Design a protein around this ligand. Structure first.
Ligand SMILES: *[C@@H]1O[C@H](CO)[C@@H](O[C@@H]2O[C@H](CO)[C@@H](O[C@H]3O[C@H](CO[C@H]4O[C@H](CO[C@H]5O[C@H](CO)[C@@H](O)[C@H](O)[C@@H]5O)[C@@H](O)[C@H](O)[C@@H]4O)[C@@H](O)[C@H](O)[C@@H]3O)[C@H](O)[C@H]2NC(C)=O)[C@H](O)[C@H]1NC(C)=O
Ligand SMILES: *[C@@H]1O[C@H](CO)[C@@H](O[C@@H]2O[C@H](CO)[C@@H](O[C@@H]3O[C@H](CO)[C@@H](O)[C@H](O)[C@@H]3O)[C@H](O)[C@H]2NC(C)=O)[C@H](O)[C@H]1NC(C)=O
Ligand SMILES: *[C@@H]1O[C@H](CO)[C@@H](O[C@@H]2O[C@H](CO)[C@@H](O[C@@H]3O[C@H](CO)[C@@H](O)[C@H](O)[C@@H]3O)[C@H](O)[C@H]2NC(C)=O)[C@H](O)[C@H]1NC(C)=O
Ligand SMILES: *[C@@H]1O[C@H](CO)[C@@H](O[C@@H]2O[C@H](CO)[C@@H](O)[C@H](O)[C@H]2NC(C)=O)[C@H](O)[C@H]1NC(C)=O
Ligand SMILES: *[C@@H]1O[C@H](CO)[C@@H](O[C@@H]2O[C@H](CO)[C@@H](O)[C@H](O)[C@H]2NC(C)=O)[C@H](O)[C@H]1NC(C)=O
Ligand SMILES: *[C@@H]1O[C@H](CO)[C@@H](O)[C@H](O)[C@H]1NC(C)=O
Ligand SMILES: [O-][O-]
Ligand SMILES: [O-][O-]
Ligand SMILES: [Cu+2]
Ligand SMILES: [Cu+2]
Ligand SMILES: [Cu+2]
Ligand SMILES: [Cu+2]
Ligand SMILES: [Cu+2]
Ligand SMILES: [Cu+2]
Ligand SMILES: [Cu+2]
Ligand SMILES: [Cu+2]
Ligand SMILES: [Cu+2]
Ligand SMILES: [Cu+2]
Ligand SMILES: [Cu+2]
Ligand SMILES: [Cu+2]
Lengths: 497, 497
C-alpha cells in the first residue's frame, strides 16, 4: 500500500489479467491501480505523472478520489471540465487534499471520458485508529481488500458506444473469460479460526455484480465509507462505484471455496470458472474449489442497512419537505442521455474556473440547463424516477463531495426519514421505483452528479450541482499548478489528447 | 416459399433467434415471416388470420406488402388508419391484389405502430419468367434470399421510445448477441463454381447496415425491385426497408467466409461473431470463418446506380421543374417528429374511408396538415432536407404505391435529371444534404410517406399523399370485408387492441 504521500505514474502497457493480452492504462505498472491508504485525518499528497503514449486510450487524464468530500479543495476532485482541465502527457500534477472527517473504503479512477475502463481505476482505504467496528474482526490489511472490475478485450473508444457487458470479471485483478478458461484465478488466503474485514470495492465501468462466497456468510459493517449496524447476509448486489466492508469468520473446514461475482449482463455465470475467484484456507491443496451454489437465504436490501451511529436526515419527514426539492426526469434520443431535457456536454472552460472567474448565476454558467445553483445550509431533496426512456437501468447515480440519505431505495415504496442508510452511490432501480435522496449544502463548490455507468456519463447522463457560488471562490483557494492546466491543455494538438 | 395463395396465421410465441428467449409476434410459427413468392402477373390471395393474445405487443394488425404499387387495390395496402382499420384478434382478413407490372424483391410487415419490431416481418419475392438479367446467374431460390433484422431483448412497447440500436442483428433469422456469443449462426450454403442471385432485404426497424462478404464482391442487379445496370462492389450500406439483388460468384476456395452486417448503432462490431453469418462452401468444415475484412475499395454509392431499362424523370431538368413541388421541413419536440409543423396522429376514420364518403379536399381530411392532395397525371417533386432538428439521421423515407426517381442522393450536391436510379426507400442523409425525389401521380388513392425507422414513424414522422381524390372511389372499389373492419375495430375493449 502506497500513500498517504505517493507518486502515481501513468503509462500504457500490455496486460493479461484474464490470460489475454491487450493494451491498457496502468498506474505504477499495474491494473487495477495500486492500493492507496492512509488514516483518518491524513493529508494525502498524490503526484500524478502522465507518461501516457496511447491516444486511442487517451494521452490526457484526470483523477477522481471517489467518496471524499474535498471541503475547500474542490479543484482537486477530478471530473474533467467540471473541477479541472485534463493533465497533459509528459506533465505532472499534485493532488493535495485532506480527509479530516471520514474513514472506510473508497477508490480512485480516471474521470475523463471512459478512461477508467481501459485501466486507470483502483482501491483507496482510510483506516480509523478508533474504528467502532474494530472489535468485530482480527485482520484488516492489504490482502483483505477485494476489487471487482469488468474487463473488456476491445478498448473503450474502439468498441461500441454502450458495451454490452464484460468479457471477464476480475476479482483482485484476475479472472477468466469463456475464451480463457484456464487463466489464473485470484486466490484470497485465510487461516481457519480468524475473522477478516474484507473490503469489497466495485471498480466497474458498467455492470453491477452479485457477490457470494460458497459455504460462508458475510456481515456488513460498512457501506460507501459509512459504518453500519452489523448485518449478516449471504449475497450482495454491488453496483458500479459502491463499496461494502464485510466480516468473514474463516470458521469452516480447511478447503477451497468458490468466491462468486456474477454480472447483471455480459458473459454470465461460472462455466469454466468465469466470474470466479478462490477463498483458500491455509493448508488446502492448490486446486479449484468443487463447492456448489445455494439459493441465497438472506440477500442484502439497502432498506435493511442502517447507520451504526445515528445520523440525522435533513428536512421534515414528509416528501418535498426541504428547501430545494428537485426531480430528475431522464430521457434518451437513441444516442444521448438527458436529465430534465439536457444532455451534459463538457464546457471548454471548467465550471470551477467559470465560478472563480466570477460567473455565479445559473444562466451565466455553461452548459446552461445542465448546471443547477443551490443555496447554503439548505436541505436538498433529489428524486430519480426510474423510466423505460433511460436504457441500461439500473443506473447507479452518484454525487460528488457529499454522502447523502437514501430516504427511498429501489424495490421499496416505503419512504424512510428516520434511520435510512447514507452513502455516495445508489441504484435508481427500474420503472416503478422513485429512488430519492437528501443532503444539506455543507461544502461550497461545483459537484458532478451523474450515472456511474461510465458509458452513460460519456453520453451526457449528468448534471453539476454548483453550491454556494458566492462563497465558492473564497472557500476553495486554488493552487498555481491548477491554473496552469487549462493553458497547457488548450495548447495541445487534437492528436495528443 | 408459399404463395401466391396462402394463409398467414399470426400468433404470439417465445423465440430464441440469438439464443435469448423472448415472447414475440410470429407468422406461421416463424419470425421472420415465411417467404412469400410468385411471379410477374400473379394474383396473390393472402388471407391474414389474426390469432394474437398479447396486448403489450398488440392484439390487432395490419399487414403492408412493401413496394407493391397496389393500383386499384389501395384498400389492401396496410398502413393502419390510412388505408384500413386494423384487423381484430379472433378475426380474418383477405388481402387480394395483383402484380402485373413488377418483379423483384419485396417484403411484408405489420404497419400498425411498432408491431413489426416485435417480429411480424418477412420477405416476399416476385420472380420474372423473362427476367432480363437471368443470364448473369445460375441459382436463384428460397435459399438465396438474405434478410437483415434488428432484434431487441425488450419489446417495442416495454422498451425506450427511441431505443439504443439493436441487441443483435439477425441474418436469415439467426444471430448472436454479446452475452449469447455461442448461439447458432446462419449458414448460407454455396457450391464452388456456381453463381447466385442473392436477394438482400433489410427488415430493419431502425438501424442501417453496412453489409460485406469476406474475400467476395457483389454485382448489384436490382435495387428496391427496379432492375439496374450491373454494378460490382464490396460493401453495401443498406437502409431500413431497402432491398438489393446481387450476384455472387462462388469461385473462391472452398472455405467459411464471414458475412458481415454491421448496424448503424447498437451492439456494434463483430466481437464474438455478433452481427454476422457464414457463407459456407459445400465441403468446408462446420466451424467459424477465420477470414478478416479489408477496407472496402468499391463501396456502393447510390449515385452510381442506374436503371437497366431507361426510365424517364418526370418534369423539367431544374429544381421545381414539375407540375407540383413540395418540401418537408423536419422538426422534433423531444418526443415527436413533425413535418411542416404537423406530426402524424392517426385519424379515427381512415384516410381512405374518408375519401370514399367524398372528402376530396385538403380542408376536409383528418389529420389536417398531414394530408397532402395531389393533382392526377402530374409530375411531383418532394425534397427532404436533413437537419439537426430531426435527430436519428439518416432517416430512410419511403413512399407507398410508387417508385420514384432519386434526382439527388445523400452525400452529393449534384442533381441527376437524366438516368438516376428509381426506388421506393431513400436515405435523406445528414444535415447539409437535400435529397429530393420525383414521380408521376398515375395511381389514385392515399399513400403513406414516412421515415421507415419505425420508432420515428410511431413518434409522428409521416404525411399522407392523397392523389386523385375525385377518381379514388371509382379506381379502388372495395370488398365487403374491408368495409366490415372499422365497425369491428370500434367495438373493441381498450384491453383487446
Ligand atoms: C409553421 O410555423 C408558422 C405557423 O405558426 C408558419 O410561419 C409562417 O410562415 C409564413 C410563410 O408565408 C409567413 O408568411 C409571411 O411572411 C413571409 C416572410 O416572413 C419571413 O420574415 C419574417 C421577419 O423576418 C425578419 O424579421 C425578423 C424579426 O421580426 C428577423 O429575426 C429576421 O432576421 C428578418 O429580418 C419572419 O418572422 C418569418 O419567419 C420569415 O422568415 C412573407 O414573405 C409572406 O408573404 C407572408 O407575409 C408567416 O410570417 C409565418 N407565421 C407565423 C405565425 O410566424 C410556418 O409557415 C409553419 N410552417 C409550415 C412549413 O407550414
Ligand atoms: C493503443 O491502444 C489501442 C487500444 O487499446 C490498441 O488497439 C489495438 O489495435 C490492434 C490493431 O488495430 C487490435 O488488434 C487486432 O484485433 C483483431 C481481432 O479483432 C485481429 O484480427 C488483428 O490481427 C489484431 O489482433 C487490438 O484489438 C486493439 N486493442 C484494443 C484493446 O482495442 C493499440 O494497439 C495501442 N497502440 C500501441 C502502439 O500499442
Ligand atoms: C407479452 O409480451 C410481453 C412483451 O414481449 C412480455 O413481457 C415480458 O415481461 C417479463 C416479465 O413479465 C419481462 O421479464 C423480466 O425482466 C426483468 C428486468 O426488468 C427481470 O427481473 C426478469 O428477467 C423478468 O422476468 C420480459 O422482459 C418481457 N419480455 C419482453 C420481450 O420485453 C410478456 O411476458 C408477454 N405475455 C405473455 C402472457 O407471455
Ligand atoms: C417521483 O417523485 C417526484 C417528486 O418527489 C415526482 O415529481 C413531481 O411531478 C410533478 C408533476 O405534476 C411536478 O409538478 C412536481 O414538481 C414534482 N415534485 C417535485 C417535488 O419536484 C414524480 O412525479 C415522481 N415520479 C414517479 C414516477 O413516481
Ligand atoms: C431543398 O430544395 C428545395 C427546392 O428543391 C428548397 O425549396 C425552396 O426554397 C426556396 C427558398 O427557401 C423557396 O423560394 C421555394 O418555394 C422552395 N421550394 C419548395 C418546393 O419548397 C428547399 O429550401 C431546400 N432546402 C435546403 C435546406 O436546402
Ligand atoms: C422537455 O421539452 C418539452 C418540450 O420542449 C417540454 O414539454 C418538457 O417539459 C421538457 N422537459 C422538462 C423541462 O422537464
Ligand atoms: O466517481 O465519479
Ligand atoms: O413500410 O411502409
Ligand atoms: Cu505496448
Ligand atoms: Cu467514482
Ligand atoms: Cu465521486
Ligand atoms: Cu498469474
Ligand atoms: Cu446509467
Ligand atoms: Cu463522478
Ligand atoms: Cu407464451
Ligand atoms: Cu415497409
Ligand atoms: Cu411501403
Ligand atoms: Cu439453431
Ligand atoms: Cu427517422
Ligand atoms: Cu409505410
Amino acid at each position: 500500500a502506497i500513500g498517504p504521500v505517493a507518486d502515481l505514474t501513468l503509462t500504457n502497457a500490455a496486460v493479461s489479467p484474464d490470460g489475454f493480452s491487450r493494451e491498457a492504462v496502468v498506474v505504477n505498472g499495474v491494473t487495477p491501480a495500486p492500493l492507496i491508504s492512509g488514516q483518518k485525518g491524513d493529508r494525502f499528497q498524490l503526484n500524478v505523472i502522465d507518461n501516457l503514449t496511447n491516444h486511442t486510450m487517451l494521452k490526457t487524464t484526470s483523477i477522481h478520489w471517489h467518496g471524499f468530500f474535498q471541503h475547500g479543495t474542490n479543484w482537486a476532485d477530478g471530473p474533467a471540465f467540471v473541477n479541472q482541465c485534463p493533465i497533459a502527457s509528459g506533465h505532472s500534477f499534485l493532488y493535495d487534499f485532506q480527509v479530516p472527517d471520514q474513514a472506510g473504503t473508497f477508490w480512485y479512477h480516471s474521470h475523463l471520458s471512459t478512461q477508467y475502463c481501459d485501466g486507470l481505476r483502483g482501491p483507496f482505504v482510510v483506516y480509523d485508529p478508533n474504528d467502532p467496528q474494530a472489535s468485530l474482526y482480527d485482520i484488516d490489511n492489504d490482502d483483505t481488500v477485494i476489487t471487482l472490475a469488468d474487463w473488456y478485450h476491445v478498448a473503450a473508444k474502439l468498441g461500441p458506444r454502450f458495451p454490452p457487458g464484460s468479457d471477464a470479471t476480475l476479482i483482485n485483478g484476475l479472472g477468466r473469460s469463456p475464451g480463457t478458461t484456464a487463466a489464473d484465478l485470484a486466490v484470497i488466503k485465510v487461516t481457519q479460526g480468524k475473522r477478516y474485514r474484507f473490503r469489497l470495492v466495485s471498480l466497474s465501468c458498467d455492470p453491477n455484480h452479485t457477490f457470494s462466497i460458497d459455504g460462508h456468510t458475510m456481515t456488513i459493517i460498512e457501506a460507501d465509507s459509512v459504518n453500519t449496524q452489523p448485518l449478516e447476509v449471504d449475497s450482495i448486489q454491488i453496483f458500479a462505484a459502491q463499496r461494502y466492508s464485510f466480516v468473514l469468520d474463516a470458521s469452516q473446514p480447511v478447503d477451497n471455496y468458490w468466491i462468486r461475482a456474477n454480472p447483471s449482463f455480459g458473459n454470465t455465470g461460472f462455466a469454466g470458472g468465469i466470474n470466479s475467484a478462490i477463498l483458500r484456507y491455509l493448508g488446502a491443496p492448490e486446486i479449484e474449489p468443487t463447492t456448489t451454489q445455494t439459493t441465497p437465504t438472506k440477500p442484502l436490501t439497502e432498506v435493511d442497512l442502517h447507520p451504526l451511529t445515528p445520523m440525522a436526515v435533513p428536512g421534515r419527514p414528509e416528501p418535498g419537505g426541504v428547501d430545494k426539492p428537485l426531480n430528475m426526469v431522464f430521457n434518451f434520443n437513441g444516442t444521448n442521455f438527458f436529465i430534465n431535457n439536457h444532455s451534459f456536454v463538457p464546457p471548454s472552460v471548467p465550471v470551477l474556473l467559470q465560478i472563480l472567474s466570477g460567473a455565479q448565476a445559473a444562466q451565466d454558467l455553461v452548459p446552461e440547463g445542465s448546471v443547477y445553483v443551490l443555496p447554503s445550509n439548505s436541505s436538498i431533496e433529489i428524486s430519480f424516477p426510474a423510466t423505460v426512456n433511460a436504457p441500461g437501468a439500473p443506473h447507479p447515480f452518484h454525487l460528488h463531495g457529499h454522502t447523502f440519505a437514501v430516504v427511498r431505495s429501489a424495490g421499496s415504496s416505503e419512504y424512510n426519514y428516520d434511520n435510512p442508510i447514507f452513502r455516495d452511490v445508489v441504484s435508481t432501480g427500474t420503472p416503478g421505483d422513485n429512488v430519492t435522496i437528501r443532503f444539506q449544502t455543507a461544502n461550497p463548490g461545483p459537484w458532478f452528479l451523474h450515472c456511474h455507468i461510465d458509458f452513460h456519463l460519456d453520453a451526457g447522463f449528468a448534471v453539476v450541482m454548483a453550491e454556494d457560488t458566492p462563497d465558492t471562490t473564497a472557500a476553495n483557494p486554488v493552487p498555481q499548478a491548477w491554473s496552469d492546466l487549462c493553458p497547457i491543455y488548450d495548447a495541445l494538438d487534437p492528436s495528443d489528447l
